[PDB]
Amino acid sequence: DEMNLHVPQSEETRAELSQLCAVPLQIVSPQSNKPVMGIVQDTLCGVR
Amino acid sequence: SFRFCLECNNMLYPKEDKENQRLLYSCRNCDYTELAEDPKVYRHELITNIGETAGIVDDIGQDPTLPRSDKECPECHSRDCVFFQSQQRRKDTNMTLFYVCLNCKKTFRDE
């Protein structure tokens, strides 16, 4: 897999990214009012 | 079963002898008009079974793909017969079988 990276070129767009799009702010989704990121693969098996 | 003309070799269509009230058959080409045997003039079917036993030949025993059963032949008590299901191909048809003996070539069934 490959993913794209976009760099904001001003302070207004930096602030928008960090205060609206940041990963911690997206943990709960409005699609099914539940989390979208969970413990996965080896940490799940290992914690069990 | 409609016939054909003894003179013009076309097909005869129904007509009425109004002076005798007897169903003739009129040639649309010639003037010939013969007496008929059957006063039926039309038919229509929805529950049909044509194609039940018709799917058999003399050398159907020579087909090496037909599965062979141990059913007793009603005719000659033969312990070896090839079998197959109804050759009619409709959706609601049975799954009942037909049985062909390899000795007398008489077809039979398990009923």
Next chain:
Amino acid sequence: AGQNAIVAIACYSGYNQEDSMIMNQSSIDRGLFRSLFFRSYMDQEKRFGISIVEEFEKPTRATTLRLKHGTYEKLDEDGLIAPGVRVSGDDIIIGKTTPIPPYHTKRDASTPLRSTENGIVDQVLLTTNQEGLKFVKVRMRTTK
């Protein structure tokens, strides 16, 4: 088209999850899954008329214009680099000039190396094409 590696199946350190996979650096150092790469560039001279043609030649700055931003210091006097020379990206490997139609009367049509690739020139071929004009093939080599 492969090699028999020694494979363990383990959740060793967590760097092999979701179809990742941990590989031995020492085995890499000893030649595991090591491969050669060969890239060949091609170029020839065209005939735009009667006496108007291109030429393989090292382009001097005075008589040429629109020279590429790469270095030309690797070409021999025939406009061709010699096998055995290390080449980096943007370096010229085939020098060519296109005459200016009616001093300083030539444009360049030089072939650089691909901007991504390093390597060492392997085999500089020289022949003539279907129409008898000069033809050059340059094969680069590298190791991945």
Next chain:
Amino acid sequence: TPALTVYLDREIALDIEKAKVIQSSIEYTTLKNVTSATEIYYDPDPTS
């Protein structure tokens, strides 16, 4: 697949015979649905 869900009246909704009678009332049958085979006979005299 068009489809209705026909809720029955409660007195019918518990009894099965009544529900089957309502089924018979609601279902569509045409003369096609109960006809086997039609002929045409020449019958010159109505009284014979």
Next chain:
Amino acid sequence: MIIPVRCFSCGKVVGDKWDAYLRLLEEGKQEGDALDELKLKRYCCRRMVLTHVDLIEKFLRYNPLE
């Protein structure tokens, strides 16, 4: 192509054993016994010699170009 000098997995020197291995195979010894006599005991070292395909013989058949 040509026999690797070291074993990939552990680093034992196997590049000096290909000719002895071929001579042992000539006189009838089966592959496991020949690998035993060359004192290749770890299956990594053994598969180094047992799975080698010697392509330099095929490359040498094309005439020297100088």
Next chain:
Amino acid sequence: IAFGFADRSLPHFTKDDFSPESKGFVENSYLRGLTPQEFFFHAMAGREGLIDTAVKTAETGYIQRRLVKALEDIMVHYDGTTRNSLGDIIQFLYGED
């Protein structure tokens, strides 16, 4: 597994054989290994899955594009209403709560 040949699934079966093995039941496990017939039937099923994955994604992407274009101009306003770009009301309170 349909009767792709005349009255059979494969030419190693006899005609009109409705048994589980004839019409695509795989009795073995992956550990035990599939027979050639079972291998071919499982290949047919996997091919169906691959075709579905390859072919349905275009219909799904089209559907999501159309939904996005239909609902793209709808915003919650400071008075609580849910309106489109024409200012028309879609819901008097968002989600009704």
Next chain:
Amino acid sequence: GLVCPAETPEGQACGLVKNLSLLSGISIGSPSEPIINFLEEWGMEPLEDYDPAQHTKSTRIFVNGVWTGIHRDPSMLVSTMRDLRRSGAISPEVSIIRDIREREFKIFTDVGRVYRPLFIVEDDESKDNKGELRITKEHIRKIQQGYDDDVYGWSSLVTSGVIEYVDGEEEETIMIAMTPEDLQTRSLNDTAKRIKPEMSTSSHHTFTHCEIHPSMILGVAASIIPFPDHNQSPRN
């Protein structure tokens, strides 16, 4: 047996781009004159002598999709055509397709038909050699030798009547044994070896052909896979 069941591109070419099986072969095409001559000699009646009032049992004979006549008795005609093809008199890549429910006999000499070789099980029900392969250890001895005892290769096997070619249409009419052991019912109980299928419905099998080896259904790319029958097919 004709195209690899596993090798196909992902995406928009899935299932449209196919890859030949290892033993697949494409017909070159062949003249239809000897076919017509053999049919005319052995008893085929023409369509200028056709009268469906009488010919209620006759089998119609197609050659390359062209109806050329009718026969009173397809059994000996198919037997003689198959013997001629297995003797070399007819091109080995010529389809000989009898249809029994439809009362038809179709011979194809078209170019471009895909075909595959099979062993020929002796199916004539008159000799102790019935129900067994005609290929024996003498044939393998000759193949290893490289010559007959008064070049012996594949084509000599094909022309000696121990291997023949079948395209998809002829395959409809044949009964193929999966392995040479399947030709005889065994009397086992190995919790490790995979259960070879019961096959209990049919009282007596009349095999006509045997696969040379079932792994030959795969193509070039699928043949590299080790134990592909222990994998789910998308991974293959």
Next chain:
Amino acid sequence: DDTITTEDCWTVISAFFEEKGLVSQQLDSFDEFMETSIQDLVWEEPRLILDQPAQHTNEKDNINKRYEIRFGKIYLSRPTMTEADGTTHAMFPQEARLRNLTYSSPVYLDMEKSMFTSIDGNKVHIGKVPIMLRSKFCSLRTLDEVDLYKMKECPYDMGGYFVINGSEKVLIAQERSAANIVQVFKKAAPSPISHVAEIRSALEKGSRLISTMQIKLYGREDKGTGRTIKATLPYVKQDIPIVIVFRALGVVPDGEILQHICYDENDWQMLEMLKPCIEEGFVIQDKEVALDFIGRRGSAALGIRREKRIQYAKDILQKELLPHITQEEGFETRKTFFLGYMVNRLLLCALERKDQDDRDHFGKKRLDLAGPLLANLFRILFRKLTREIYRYMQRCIETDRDFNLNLAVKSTTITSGLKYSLATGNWGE
């Protein structure tokens, strides 16, 4: 004798691969092409003819003057290379690969120009055909492993490809439905037509498509009251009833039409489904009127009189109607019998007495390898060339001079066409 083991099977399989290899289909297809196909395409249309009888401002003196050339044998030589000096020598695939050349053989066609005048020529080079490596015309066929090594060729290289401008090209086999087979298809709900028997026709010589002819069953289940069957002849716009074409082919009495259709008079459902056809085509009773009825629809120019409208329709019924049956006159009975067979297959599918034909069945498909593909392309390009020869003999002959035909053939047409198709993949002009 002992039981054949698995190892015996692998010995047989090793024999198979020792004989045939892995690319034998490409090589054998191309060898067949170069041995027979080129000559057969040249003899497909083997003669050109110019003509002028009279009235060119002369003294009423009239002479019939035919200029004519007959194409003869094809001569196939080994691939050669021509330098800008004009020197020539043998060309090998490695040299063609290094200098971006095309690895092709010269094709010569003998031409013998004839003229006839009634009062009332060497091995012309027609183009270069690319050669499939490791085939019977490649220069790497006669060599042993030693010489192969000296020619810079890998012994593992199996051939099967072409070299165009120094680039290796492989022809992908093309899959197509078989030819000269009747297939019967179900149809869709908002369609008056329910059952369609479709056959494509082709000839044993050339293996090229000629014409297509569907036979549809109008009338849906319980809708479309007329359950007639109507043919679709090529080169006519509107669909003709079936009894019309049976009458046009020379069997007028409806009993004989049915008998060509009905093998078993006792059967009644099919005969009950055949009446609306007889009624919708009851008007005609002879061949001329039906055949005009066909002619009135032939999509030709407007207003042809009856006597030659008949000739046009008779020509359509003779050629472009089942060419695989025969394209010569006096054999209409076989076409009528095939029409009866096709109608019966239609009715069997329509009366549910047989299942509809399987489109995906691999026995009803053909694979077109290098041979037939190059045959199609070469036929196109050589008809181009012969049209050029005609266009040239129109002009040069006016000069009233002897001409040597080596300036009459522009050899670059076939060469450029083959090279363009094999280098781009676009199969056509």
Next chain:
RNA sequence: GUCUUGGGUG
């Protein structure tokens, strides 16, 4: 520096 064709990747 442009357009088509083909082979692919997630």
